[PDB]
Paper text:
We co-crystallised Ca2+/CaM variants with the RyR23583-3603 peptide to gain an atomistic understanding of the interaction. All the complexes gave clear electron density for four Ca2+ ions at the N- and C-terminal Ca2+ binding grooves. The interactions between CaM residues and Ca2+ ions were conserved and identical in all the structures. In the Ca2+/CaM-WT–RyR23583-3603 structure, atoms Nδ2 Asn53 and N Asn53 form a direct hydrogen bond with O of another CaM residue, Gln49. Oδ1 Asn53 also forms a hydrogen bond with Oδ2 Asp56 through the water molecule W1. Asp56 in turn is involved in Ca2+ binding in the EF-hand. For Ca2+/CaM, interaction with RyR23583-3603 is enthalpy driven and Kd is significantly decreased from 15±3 µM to 52±4 nM, as previously shown. Ca2+/CaM-WT–RyR23583-3603 binding showed favourable entropy, suggesting an important contribution of hydrophobic interactions, whereas the CPVT variants have unfavourable entropy, indicating a different binding mechanism comprising hydrogen and Van der Waals bonds, which can account for the measured reduction in affinity. The binding event is initiated by the C-terminal region of CaM and further completed by the N-terminal region.
CaM is a highly conserved Ca2+-sensing protein encoded by three independent genes CALM1, CALM2 and CALM3, and all three encode an identical 16.7 kDa 148 amino-acid-long protein. The dumbbell-like structure of CaM comprises of four EF-hand motifs, each able to bind one Ca2+ ion. Moreover, Ca2+ binding induces a large conformational transition in CaM that exposes hydrophobic patches within the helices of the EF-hands, which permit interaction with a wide range of targets.
Author numbering:
A (entry chain AAA): 6 to 149
B (entry chain BBB): 1 to 21
The structure:
């Protein structure tokens, strides 16, 4: 559908750093390292090779579309926010705590301080219970 | 800062896409 092709182009545009229409191992590695991952050049080759269809060793948008159609057909901004909240809420009590947000930041390669964590929880925490529930998270996350 | 919340959601979205390769 048109909504999800739009979705997947936006995603592709996050990886295609130079806007040349192809994702390279250099660009995929740059993205993965920004997420606090440490891939080898071999892991990056294996990932590009699974998605590559013409054996040129880079991913164009049609190849990326085929991957997303096989692996993520249903994702929307809404399903993405629900999934992120489930991943962030480590103990599954329906609230993100300061300690859970610290864990998430470390897991995604985001430098943190306790003052930043406190400010983030306080700004998202609409009801003032001290933690961020799903309604609060959606309010914070709807705008890019 | 709302920018950092937005940035974490975006990082999680890109992690999910990386996982598809
Ligand atoms: Ca490129
Ligand atoms: Ca290719
Ligand atoms: Ca929790
Ligand atoms: Ca709250």
């Amino acid at each position: 559908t048109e909504e999800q092709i739009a979705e997947f182009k936006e995603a592709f545009s996050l990886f295609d750093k130079d806007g040349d229409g192809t994702i390279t191992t250099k660009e995929l590695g740059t993205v993965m390292r920004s997420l606090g991952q440490n891939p080898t050049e071999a892991e990056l080759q294996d990932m590009i090779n699974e998605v590559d269809a013409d054996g040129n060793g880079t991913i164009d948008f049609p190849e990326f579309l085929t991957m997303m159609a096989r692996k993520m057909k249903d994702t929307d901004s809404e399903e993405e926010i629900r999934e992120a909240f489930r991943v962030f809420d480590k103990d599954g009590n329906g609230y993100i705590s300061a300690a859970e947000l610290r864990h998430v930041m470390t897991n995604l390669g985001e430098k943190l301080t306790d003052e930043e964590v406190d400010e983030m929880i306080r700004e998202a925490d609409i009801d003032g219970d001290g933690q961020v529930n799903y309604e609060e998270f959606v309010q914070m996350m709807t705008a890019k | 800062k709302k920018a950092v919340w937005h940035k974490l959601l975006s990082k999680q979205r890109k992690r999910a896409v990386v996982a598809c390769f």
